[PDB]
Amino acid sequence: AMGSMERASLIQKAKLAEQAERYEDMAAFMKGAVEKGEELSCEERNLLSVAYKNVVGGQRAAWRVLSSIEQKSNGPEVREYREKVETELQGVCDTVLGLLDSHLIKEAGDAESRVFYLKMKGDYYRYLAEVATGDDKKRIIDSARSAYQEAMDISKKEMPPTNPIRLGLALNFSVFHYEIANSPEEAISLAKTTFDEAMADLHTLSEDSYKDSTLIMQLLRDNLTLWT
């Protein structure tokens, strides 16, 4: 629906929608920008991520409310409405994964861009895995695992341990281990090693980079405090 808008106008409107807290609009503008076929800048990648994380975050929060009501109940209405929200969440995940596969990831040559997109691929397979219950659930989980793993391999070879995308990737892969893969010891080990290796690299950073890194480092510490 955004094929007739200029790329730069779509980007400008995505930023306006963020200020207006209109995240569905933001996501549609950023989807249109991606479909122009040009690679995304660092700032544009962040806009894409923020938009869809907010959209799917609201859907996940609703799904969790309805799932809890449904489990306490165990008429068809609660199940039906949970299924409606579930289907809409899966549709958004499929949309993002489709943008990544056509053709963001294959054109991402730099480590920063490629890791960013593989992290997103892991995240949206994780969100699919949160609601999955059928024949493909193990394959959905393994698709999340495989995307996170390739991103970690690249990030460990190509990025400093304090890089915010590397830190966020490890954070989310550790949540995957704890919440999805039923591997809490793997989750704890990854969070601790990531935190310790970033701590030892802080001395190389400017004050602004230091603020970025320690912000995500605190989320790793919050989880370790919750998990141990």
Binding site: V50, K53, D123, G168, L171, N172, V175, Y178, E179, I216, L219, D222, N223, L226, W227
Partner: peptide, 7 residues
């Protein structure tokens, strides 16, 4: 209930 990456 654990924290994934967030702004």
């Amino acid at each position: 209930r654990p924290s994934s990456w967030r702004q």
